[PDB]
Every structure is written in C-alpha cells, then in structure tokens.
Design a protein around this nucleic acid. Structure first.
Ligand SMILES: [Mg+2]
Ligand SMILES: [Mg+2]
Ligand SMILES: [Mg+2]
Ligand SMILES: [Mg+2]
Ligand SMILES: [Mg+2]
Ligand SMILES: [Mg+2]
Ligand SMILES: [Mg+2]
Ligand SMILES: [Mg+2]
Ligand SMILES: [Mg+2]
Ligand SMILES: [Mg+2]
Ligand SMILES: [Mg+2]
Ligand SMILES: [Mg+2]
Ligand SMILES: [Mg+2]
Ligand SMILES: [Mg+2]
Ligand SMILES: [Mg+2]
Ligand SMILES: [Mg+2]
Ligand SMILES: [Mg+2]
Ligand SMILES: [Mg+2]
Ligand SMILES: [Mg+2]
Ligand SMILES: [Mg+2]
Ligand SMILES: [Mg+2]
Ligand SMILES: [Mg+2]
Ligand SMILES: [Mg+2]
Ligand SMILES: [Mg+2]
Ligand SMILES: [Mg+2]
Ligand SMILES: [Mg+2]
Ligand SMILES: [Mg+2]
Ligand SMILES: [Mg+2]
Ligand SMILES: [Mg+2]
Ligand SMILES: [Mg+2]
Ligand SMILES: [Mg+2]
Ligand SMILES: [Mg+2]
Ligand SMILES: [Mg+2]
Ligand SMILES: [Mg+2]
Ligand SMILES: [Mg+2]
Ligand SMILES: [Mg+2]
Ligand SMILES: [Mg+2]
Ligand SMILES: [Mg+2]
Ligand SMILES: [Mg+2]
Ligand SMILES: [Mg+2]
Ligand SMILES: [Mg+2]
Ligand SMILES: [Mg+2]
Ligand SMILES: [Mg+2]
Ligand SMILES: [Mg+2]
Ligand SMILES: [Mg+2]
Ligand SMILES: [Mg+2]
Ligand SMILES: [Mg+2]
Ligand SMILES: [Mg+2]
Ligand SMILES: [Mg+2]
Ligand SMILES: [Mg+2]
Ligand SMILES: [Mg+2]
Ligand SMILES: [Mg+2]
Ligand SMILES: [Mg+2]
Ligand SMILES: [Mg+2]
Ligand SMILES: [Mg+2]
Ligand SMILES: [Mg+2]
Ligand SMILES: [Mg+2]
Ligand SMILES: [Mg+2]
Ligand SMILES: [Mg+2]
Ligand SMILES: [Mg+2]
Ligand SMILES: [Mg+2]
Ligand SMILES: [Mg+2]
Ligand SMILES: [Mg+2]
Ligand SMILES: [Mg+2]
Ligand SMILES: [Mg+2]
Ligand SMILES: [Mg+2]
Ligand SMILES: [Mg+2]
Ligand SMILES: [Mg+2]
Ligand SMILES: [Mg+2]
Ligand SMILES: [Mg+2]
Ligand SMILES: [Mg+2]
Ligand SMILES: [Mg+2]
Ligand SMILES: [Mg+2]
Ligand SMILES: [Mg+2]
Ligand SMILES: [Mg+2]
Ligand SMILES: [Mg+2]
Ligand SMILES: [Mg+2]
Ligand SMILES: [Mg+2]
Ligand SMILES: [Mg+2]
Ligand SMILES: [Mg+2]
Ligand SMILES: [Mg+2]
Ligand SMILES: [Mg+2]
Ligand SMILES: [Mg+2]
Ligand SMILES: [Mg+2]
Ligand SMILES: [Mg+2]
Lengths: 271, 46, 93
RNA sequence: AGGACCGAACCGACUAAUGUUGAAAAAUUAGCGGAUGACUUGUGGCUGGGGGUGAAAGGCCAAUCAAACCGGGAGAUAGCU
RNA sequence: GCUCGCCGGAAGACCAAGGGUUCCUGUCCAACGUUAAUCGGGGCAGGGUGAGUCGACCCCUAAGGCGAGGCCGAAAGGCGUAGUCGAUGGGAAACAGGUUAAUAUUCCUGUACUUGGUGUUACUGCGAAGGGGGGACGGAGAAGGCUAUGUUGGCCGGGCGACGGUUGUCCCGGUUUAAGCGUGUAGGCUGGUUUUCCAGGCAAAUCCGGAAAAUCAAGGCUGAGGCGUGAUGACGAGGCACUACGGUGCUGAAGCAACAAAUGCCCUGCUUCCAGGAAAAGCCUCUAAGCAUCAGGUAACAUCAAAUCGUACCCCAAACCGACACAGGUGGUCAGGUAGAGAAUACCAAGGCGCUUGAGAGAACUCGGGUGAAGGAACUAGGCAAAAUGGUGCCGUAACUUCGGGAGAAGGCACGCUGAUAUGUAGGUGAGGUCCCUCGCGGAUGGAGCUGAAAUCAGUCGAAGAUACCAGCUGGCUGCAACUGUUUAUUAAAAACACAGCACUGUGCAAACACGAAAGUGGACGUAUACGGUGUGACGCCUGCCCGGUGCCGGAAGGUUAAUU
C-alpha cells in the first residue's frame, strides 16, 4: 500500500513509498532474462542526444510477452513480480503445455487465476481478444496498433483504454491522453486496467531517490550564460524573453506534431 | 601533485602506435610525413 | 625428428662463470649459449647427439643485452639465450 | 532503518601563519568539512574545437580556453611604436 | 665496534602500474653527488633472472572497436549484419625445507597434483554450429562455529648476577611443522523413489518443463575447522671443530595444554530492504543428421608431453609522474606487545633509518614554541590569533517543534592505589571421572583447571587520580538558504547551482525532441501513472486585478499577396 516514512532524518521526512506484499520476494525467472546495459543518453555517435540520463541501479530486462498469441491454451498465474524496467508489475504465468511467460499484470490479477488468449476467450480481465470480439464500452489495456505487432497503448501502471465505438473495420478508442483514435478491429487488446494503480502516489523524498533511477540534475536555462542557453545572462535575475528550448524553439504552447501519414487515424486531438 | 602524464603502455600503443596510425588514411599521412622528414622513430612503438 | 643441420646450428658456446662451475660440480648441469630461437626440445636433442650424453631436463632463460657507452655513443649488446642442461648423474661430459 | 550521529583510513579545502628568486609554477604546519553514500577509487572504453562536457563558475577539454594544440594560407594587415 | 636518538597501520615487508640493469662483485674519483669522499643509484669491466602448477600466452565473453556482403554518402568516407577482436571479469593443477655475492613456489631434497595424447585390457550407443541445467552475481544487518594470532602455564636448555636482596611464587631463550591424502564435523539447502501421459523447449530427445498415480518416509547436495597421515622426516635453543674473522663441518633437548581472539574462513551462507542487483565459455546432460558388431564412449594399467615469453632490481620511492638525489602525487596485500573503543594516540618488537655541508658564538630582528605580576577584548574592520572546553558512568536538562528533534542543551557528582566482600565475585570456557547409547568429530551429569568484569565497604598517597598523548567552548536575538550535496583545478564555497515537491506546455509511437547532407542511433526494447522542454524550489497559509503592447493558440468571411499561366 501507500505508507509514509517517519521523519527520523531530513531525507526521510517526506518519503512516501508504495509497498506490495504480494510481489514475489525471490529471484526472477532466469530463462526470461536478458542483459541491457545503460546508454547515458548517448547515441551511436557518442553524443548526448537526450539530456538528464545517467547512473542508476543495474537492471536486467524481463522479456515480457506483449503479443499474447498463444491462442486456445489456458494459463495460470504463478506469481506477481517486480519489474525494474516499467511502472507496472509483471505476472509470471504458466501454460498447460509447460511453457512460462511474463505478462503485464492487470488490476485484480492474483496468483492462481486463469488467463487465456484467442477469439473465443471469455470476457474477463487478463484475457486477450481481437477488439471485434471485445464488446463496445469495455475497458482494455495493452492495445495493439497493427495486427500481430504487439500491444503498444495503455501499458503504464493504472492506464487503460476505452472502446467507444465500432464502425466497420475500425474501432474507436479513447486513449489516456483524451485523444480519440481509430485502430483496426483485428488488433488485440487485454481486458481490464493495468495494475499497480497506486504507483503515482509515491514521493521520492530526496535527490538521491531520483539519482537511483538514473536521472541526472536539470540546470535551468535562466541560470546559464548566454553562450549556453537562449535564457542565459543577466545581472541578477533577468529573464525578459519568450521561453524557449535550449535550441531556440518556443516551449509554452507551440505544437510540434507533424505527421500527415497518421493524421487520418486521429478522430479528435487530446485538447 | 598529480601531473598530466600518467604513463600506461597499453593506452600509449592503442592511441599512438603503428597499427593505430595505419588504421586511418590520416594516420597513414602522418606516417608518410614522418618518413619524408626522415624520422628515425616513426611511432611510439619503438 | 629434428634435422641434423638444425641440431648443428642451435648450440653456440659453453658459458663459463662461477655459477656455471658450481652447477657443474654440484648438480651435474652444463650451461650453454644457444640460438636465440632454440627450443628446449631442440637443445636436448642437440646436446644428446653432439656430446654423447643423456639429458633429463633443460631450463632456458633469455639474457638481455647491456646498454653501453662507447665514446658518448649509445650502444647495446645483443640478447642471447642461456640453457641449463642437466645430465643423468653418470654422464660427466 | 537512515543522502542519521561522533570519529581514523579515504575524499575534500573554511581560517590563520610561513613561503612568495619557495622544499613546491598552488605546498607546509596548526586547526577545519564529509566520512554507507547524489560516496570514493583501480583498469579499460566513448564524446573533438564554434565542437565536446558542464548539480552552471564562462568552469574544464594535457601547467594553454569569451573558442585547445600543431602545420599551412603567411612575409595576413598595422594611417601605430 | 659500543653507546644515543627516530619510525613502527611505517619512515617495515611483498606486489601491480611505470622504469630498464639502477641488482652483485672487482676496480677508479676526472665530471655527477648542492661540502670532503677511500663512498655511491657515478665511470670501467665481469657476473646475475632456470617453471607442466606463478603470470602472460591460451579458451570465453563486457563496455567498446573493426567489420565480408549490405545500407548510405560529391570524393574521402559514415553506419552496421554474419563474424572477429577487446579484461579491469569467468576457465586445470605445488607445498614445506635447504642453497648463491646476486634467482628461486622456477634450482636441490622430500612429498604431491592437473590436463592431454598414444597403447593395451574389459565393457558399452557414440555423435552438434542445436535443447536444457550450471556457471550466475545487489545493499545493509545479525549471530553462531572456527582459524590466523597472542597471552599464560607446563616442559627443555641455560643462569645465580658490577650496588642492598635474588635456590625461587626467581631471570633469559626455545617450545615450529605445509600442500596432498583419508575421515566427514558446527552449519546451510533440499522431500526422495518408481511408473504413465503431454498443444512446451524452432526438429528430436530417455534431458528440461508440465499433468496424474503409487510408494517410502529419510535420501541427496554443500560444508569451515578438528583428527589421522604426510612426519622414525625436516626444523630446532645450544654445544663441539675450524678456516680465518665473512662464515665453514658435526651433533642436537623440549617441541604440550589452557585461555583469549579477528575486519580472515564456514559465507556466492542466513535475515531483511528496494533502488530489484553482467555475459559467454569451460562443466554436466539430451538427442538430430550421421556412423553403425567400425568408429566413438567409460573404466584400469603403462608410456609420452605440457611449448614460447616474463622472472634481476626500485616500487608511497634518490630508480615511477613532478626539468633536481624536489618537504608534492601514486592502486592492492600483510597487520606483533603494553595501555586504549580503536587500523586514533604514546612507548616498543621484527625490521628500517638519523633525512650528503659542518664547526663555533649565544647581538638586533624574523620564524616555531613555553611561562608570565595586576587587569581581562580596554585590541581590532572583526575576539583574527591565542587561551579555554574536551573521557566514561550516573543525575538533570528550557523556549520552540514538522513530535523525529532541540540535546552531548545547560549544569553537576564519582574516578588513583590497597584490602575485604570473594586467599578471583557475577559471568565465560570447560578436563578428568561417572553414566547412556541409534559407539562416536556422540548425548547426560559433573565440576578440576584457566579467564574474569562491575559494585559496595574500609583504608591510604599526592597540590592535583578522565594526571601524559588523546579529547565538544557554551548560551541568547536576528538576515538568507528548507535540509545531505555541487561550484570558479591555481585569490570568490556563498545567499550562487542542484534538490525532493509544484505548475505550465509539447508528445498517440516510425512520439515529441536530439546527434547526423543520409543510412541510422538515442528517447526506449519505454507507451500519457510515459517521455521532452520551461519556470519555481521541503513544509504551512496562500498565490489578487490587467489580454491594451509583444508572444503563443484557434478561426478563415473579407482585403493584400509568390512561383506558375
Ligand atoms: Mg530532463
Ligand atoms: Mg525539475
Ligand atoms: Mg551565473
Ligand atoms: Mg555546448
Ligand atoms: Mg543566444
Ligand atoms: Mg535586478
Ligand atoms: Mg524589467
Ligand atoms: Mg621460463
Ligand atoms: Mg552520515
Ligand atoms: Mg578558497
Ligand atoms: Mg591540513
Ligand atoms: Mg577529518
Ligand atoms: Mg555531519
Ligand atoms: Mg563525521
Ligand atoms: Mg581548426
Ligand atoms: Mg559572469
Ligand atoms: Mg588547463
Ligand atoms: Mg573565433
Ligand atoms: Mg595571402
Ligand atoms: Mg601561418
Ligand atoms: Mg609580419
Ligand atoms: Mg614492467
Ligand atoms: Mg649504468
Ligand atoms: Mg649496489
Ligand atoms: Mg662498487
Ligand atoms: Mg664533490
Ligand atoms: Mg681530492
Ligand atoms: Mg654503479
Ligand atoms: Mg624442473
Ligand atoms: Mg595459473
Ligand atoms: Mg561486440
Ligand atoms: Mg563499423
Ligand atoms: Mg563493405
Ligand atoms: Mg575472442
Ligand atoms: Mg584479467
Ligand atoms: Mg585468470
Ligand atoms: Mg634478491
Ligand atoms: Mg548452453
Ligand atoms: Mg561475477
Ligand atoms: Mg552483499
Ligand atoms: Mg589457535
Ligand atoms: Mg595451528
Ligand atoms: Mg634449570
Ligand atoms: Mg650484591
Ligand atoms: Mg619462560
Ligand atoms: Mg519430468
Ligand atoms: Mg598435523
Ligand atoms: Mg570493514
Ligand atoms: Mg623478485
Ligand atoms: Mg616503504
Ligand atoms: Mg638529499
Ligand atoms: Mg620525493
Ligand atoms: Mg592514497
Ligand atoms: Mg597496535
Ligand atoms: Mg582513550
Ligand atoms: Mg599511529
Ligand atoms: Mg616511537
Ligand atoms: Mg630493532
Ligand atoms: Mg635565540
Ligand atoms: Mg616568537
Ligand atoms: Mg602559552
Ligand atoms: Mg597575565
Ligand atoms: Mg594571574
Ligand atoms: Mg574574568
Ligand atoms: Mg566580553
Ligand atoms: Mg573596542
Ligand atoms: Mg580603539
Ligand atoms: Mg564592536
Ligand atoms: Mg579563532
Ligand atoms: Mg589552542
Ligand atoms: Mg566532562
Ligand atoms: Mg536554536
Ligand atoms: Mg554533559
Ligand atoms: Mg566462576
Ligand atoms: Mg575460547
Ligand atoms: Mg523579521
Ligand atoms: Mg538586517
Ligand atoms: Mg543551503
Ligand atoms: Mg553542506
Ligand atoms: Mg572541488
Ligand atoms: Mg579558486
Ligand atoms: Mg528509433
Ligand atoms: Mg530560484
Ligand atoms: Mg486579443
Ligand atoms: Mg494565426
């Protein structure tokens, strides 16, 4: 649950942590693990291309099955697990044929529950179906964008997508952003919301907590010299400029989407 | 205190050796210049 | 089999010193200067075939040349190989 | 338990005195701060000059930085000494 | 040579990196050495580095590099697939003693171990570029069992003291032994075993995973240390004989126990937390193609092989980085005694040094210190500097508070030594003996011996008992920043930067955004509870009015308006 720490030190005074007793306390499932070393925000040229990234705790990648294409073989949830690579919990499920897979844990999924993917699966949380077989008004997550490609929408903790209409070969979704989008009716979705909905109530409490997650400090543009930022310079605290990015593009309200390729699928922007 | 030259034979070779020079056309031009000048020691290798 | 001319080339000279003597009169070991690229097997075969003795083991070390001054001129002697050849306690070259 | 406390190693550098053709092109002595962490350190690797990197001082990039060093344009130009 | 002094968690010892002959011996003192020099890291000559087990090489991979084809690019070239490199990581094996002027886990002595190739003998399903297991992994904490090691006792050898005493409850010294091999202990983990079946492990599998029965209820894995052996050996205080004053040869006593005890080992363990903690090979195992009474595999025995390169010496320094024989810098390992909490500190051991100019004198003045009448901040920009406080146990402790703090608030008392309680206590350890048995590295009882606080009472010395070294000054009001951190290497450490928190805004994934003529890459193997940018800066109470100007967002009737025609 959500527990406040006690102020035995200034760095603990404001910490709020989210603790789940249900999470498996042992090592993860070794066959489904890979190495993933860190980048530091650097690309193959060796240059910082995304700022504010570096350090943090070592992590191993858990191969999560986002496709859910083992059709017609029921599986049972073995345990819930902590995944360092995302904000949601991953459930280790076991198929009747002896195969084990990691899936995103929906809300309410406890150990021992039965899940199944396919066109004929029951309408219950954790089951993956094509959205033409999912009834309208249903709440889904791990939504696909192209058939067979893998779920891509509503994968963070507590997120979900609502199927608001079905007209022909396309279903209309309401994304978490508030955007109304069309996607093909043959894409798959998993019923129910993503678990760990209390993830947003946590409070890191101190700077070290953010440094543990690989996040490096942010230097304000207005604290720099003019050679460094458009906001730099001044005698005392001076701004007198329209706010911009470090590369001179206006940064409060100016839209940046430009994709006429996918413009056709957007029923209504998020506003 | 801690000066600027901290010797390390491996790094010295890997960054200024014969094969490091030959790996690039600019390094080969360096070698050509030193040969034309007549240097008795082309690289840090010897 | 290692060829006769290889054997006739690998050995260069006997090494004369107090340590070499002490080795000879105490542990039945002769000390030789050998070819810089001579292997232990080659040295063993050569000494057996050219001195008519039995050898049980050979120990080799490479001696580095001394940097020297010859009228403020920089010189350097050549590296050579030294072999510790042990004989079979009855051979007495 | 803890970016918890006192305090050696270790990391740093607040004050004073000395030195200032120095023992030292940044140190010594007496004190001083952190000392399980946003800690410190070895080895190797990557980012290259209007570029890097910067918990941001225009700081650092080989005792060199409001644009490194080396060679070249080059005997730049100099109504000035 | 004999005294004196200094370090002793180093100023001792051993390595890595780096250096390269500085190592040892003989010889010389021109130059070098901040003086002399017979000396030297100086000159000259000669000598010296011995490996199947140490390291490299080698097999395997990380970050990253290179990269057949490929994609991209005026050219040069960039990126990258298959691959192939790349340790700072994973992977077989040796110890003790002796010896040189200089090497030694390398040589010698003794005793071992590993891998591979052959050859026989016996038995037999072998086979991978594929499958599975394993390798294989965090932080913190706690305890138990041990050992290294130390102390004391016992034992053995020696001594009977330059000055009162010293045949004893006295003094000095020694009391050491490895790998390997056998055993399998404290502890840790784990239910085994046999069938039958299966949408899984790209195919197959007897292997792994899954499912259902039966059955046994103890089987397996791991594991420090001890014990035995290794070892009737070696070593050993000394004693005896000598060159020749360096050291040579022979012999050789005791070689036990108790207690204390690691930061080392069991332990890659156990408990717990969230920030969720490499890879690949060696290794074990399963089969496919294939070979099929051949190969190949297993076991026993014999034999052969284990190449090549490093190995000297310095290594917190006169040998490395600093132009110097330079108060500087430099990663790892070892870790004795007394006191102490301690790797602080003081004095010492082992060991190493007295820092490559000295001799006098005892002016001013400068530097580093000690003490100071009376006063006590009057000094000064400012208590700068100095002085002072300082330990342990106990008593006691305010405003305020986010209820944790403030707090070691403040302030005070006791503190040595001797005796008794108690010829050494509470406690710890624990022999002999006795008993039991699923009989031995076992259990129960038992207390010898060893070790051993803390307290009370009484006495006693000094001016002073936390006596040295070591070791908080304290309190009150207020500005700023919430706090821990970061910063101008070399005049600024702060109120500056960051920060957790807050808000605005962009971004629907081939995301926005950034590096790139591009291909690509980062964001992210993430998906709006996510990511980028901007401002503010814990927390509490809050955050008012203005859209005229500039910017942004939206609109698109009208005016104006490019190439083009
Ligand atoms: Mg950022
Ligand atoms: Mg921020
Ligand atoms: Mg500024
Ligand atoms: Mg920049
Ligand atoms: Mg600008
Ligand atoms: Mg102002
Ligand atoms: Mg103004
Ligand atoms: Mg060798
Ligand atoms: Mg602390
Ligand atoms: Mg300063
Ligand atoms: Mg100091
Ligand atoms: Mg300190
Ligand atoms: Mg503190
Ligand atoms: Mg401290
Ligand atoms: Mg240029
Ligand atoms: Mg400025
Ligand atoms: Mg500089
Ligand atoms: Mg310029
Ligand atoms: Mg010109
Ligand atoms: Mg020029
Ligand atoms: Mg000129
Ligand atoms: Mg070397
Ligand atoms: Mg010399
Ligand atoms: Mg010498
Ligand atoms: Mg000499
Ligand atoms: Mg002289
Ligand atoms: Mg003279
Ligand atoms: Mg010399
Ligand atoms: Mg040998
Ligand atoms: Mg080895
Ligand atoms: Mg690679
Ligand atoms: Mg490439
Ligand atoms: Mg090509
Ligand atoms: Mg390789
Ligand atoms: Mg290595
Ligand atoms: Mg190794
Ligand atoms: Mg030596
Ligand atoms: Mg494998
Ligand atoms: Mg590891
Ligand atoms: Mg740990
Ligand atoms: Mg012991
Ligand atoms: Mg012992
Ligand atoms: Mg006696
Ligand atoms: Mg007397
Ligand atoms: Mg004694
Ligand atoms: Mg099975
Ligand atoms: Mg024994
Ligand atoms: Mg420790
Ligand atoms: Mg040595
Ligand atoms: Mg030393
Ligand atoms: Mg000197
Ligand atoms: Mg020095
Ligand atoms: Mg150090
Ligand atoms: Mg001590
Ligand atoms: Mg003390
Ligand atoms: Mg000390
Ligand atoms: Mg001392
Ligand atoms: Mg001594
Ligand atoms: Mg005087
Ligand atoms: Mg004075
Ligand atoms: Mg005084
Ligand atoms: Mg006075
Ligand atoms: Mg007085
Ligand atoms: Mg007074
Ligand atoms: Mg006063
Ligand atoms: Mg005054
Ligand atoms: Mg005055
Ligand atoms: Mg005043
Ligand atoms: Mg002061
Ligand atoms: Mg003082
Ligand atoms: Mg006190
Ligand atoms: Mg206060
Ligand atoms: Mg007090
Ligand atoms: Mg007792
Ligand atoms: Mg004990
Ligand atoms: Mg006020
Ligand atoms: Mg004021
Ligand atoms: Mg502050
Ligand atoms: Mg601070
Ligand atoms: Mg600093
Ligand atoms: Mg400064
Ligand atoms: Mg991409
Ligand atoms: Mg601010
Ligand atoms: Mg308006
Ligand atoms: Mg507009």
């Amino acid at each position: 649950a959500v527990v406040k720490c006690k102020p035995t030190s200034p760095g603990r005074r404001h910490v709020v942590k989210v603790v789940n007793p249900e999470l498996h306390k042992g090592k993860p499932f070794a066959p489904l693990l890979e190495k993933n070393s860190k980048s530091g925000g650097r690309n193959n040229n060796g240059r910082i291309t995304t700022r504010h990234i570096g350090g943090g705790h070592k992590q191993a990648y858990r191969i999560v099955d986002f496709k859910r294409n083992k059709d017609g073989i029921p599986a049972v949830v073995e345990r819930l697990e902590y995944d360092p690579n995302r904000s949601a919990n991953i459930a280790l499920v076991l198929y009747k044929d002896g195969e084990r897979r990691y899936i995103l844990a929906p809300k309410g999924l406890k150990a021992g529950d039965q899940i199944q993917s396919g066109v004929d699966a029951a309408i219950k949380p954790g089951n993956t179906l094509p959205m033409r077989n999912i009834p309208v008004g249903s709440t889904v997550h791990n939504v696909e964008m192209k058939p067979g490609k893998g779920g891509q929408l509503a994968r963070s903790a507590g997120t979900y997508v609502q199927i608001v209409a079905r007209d022909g070969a396309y279903v209309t979704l309401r994304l978490r952003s508030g955007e109304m989008r069309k996607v093909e009716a043959d894409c798959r979705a998993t019923l129910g919301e993503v678990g760990n909905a209390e993830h947003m109530l946590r409070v890191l409490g101190k700077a070290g907590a953010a440094r543990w997650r690989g996040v490096r400090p942010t230097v304000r543009g207005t604290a720099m010299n003019p050679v460094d930022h458009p906001h730099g310079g001044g005698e005392g605290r001076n701004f007198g400029k329209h706010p911009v990015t470090p590369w001179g593009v206006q940064t409060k309200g100016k839209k940046t989407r430009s994709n006429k390729r996918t413009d056709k699928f957007i029923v209504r922007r998020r506003s | 205190m801690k000066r600027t030259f901290q010797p390390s034979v491996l790094k010295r070779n890997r960054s200024h050796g014969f094969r490091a020079r030959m790996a690039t056309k600019n390094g080969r031009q360096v070698l050509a210049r030193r040969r034309a000048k007549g240097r008795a020691r082309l690289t840090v290798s010897k | 089999m290692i060829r006769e001319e290889r054997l006739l080339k690998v050995l260069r000279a006997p090494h004369v010193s107090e340590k070499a003597s002490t080795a000879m009169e105490k542990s039945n070991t002769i000390v030789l200067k050998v070819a810089k690229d001579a292997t232990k097997a080659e040295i063993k075969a050569a000494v057996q075939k050219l001195f008519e003795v039995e050898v049980e083991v050979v120990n080799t070390l490479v001696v580095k040349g001394k940097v020297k001054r010859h009228g403020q001129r920089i010189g350097r002697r050549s590296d050579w190989k030294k072999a510790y050849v042990t004989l079979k306690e009855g051979q007495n070259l």
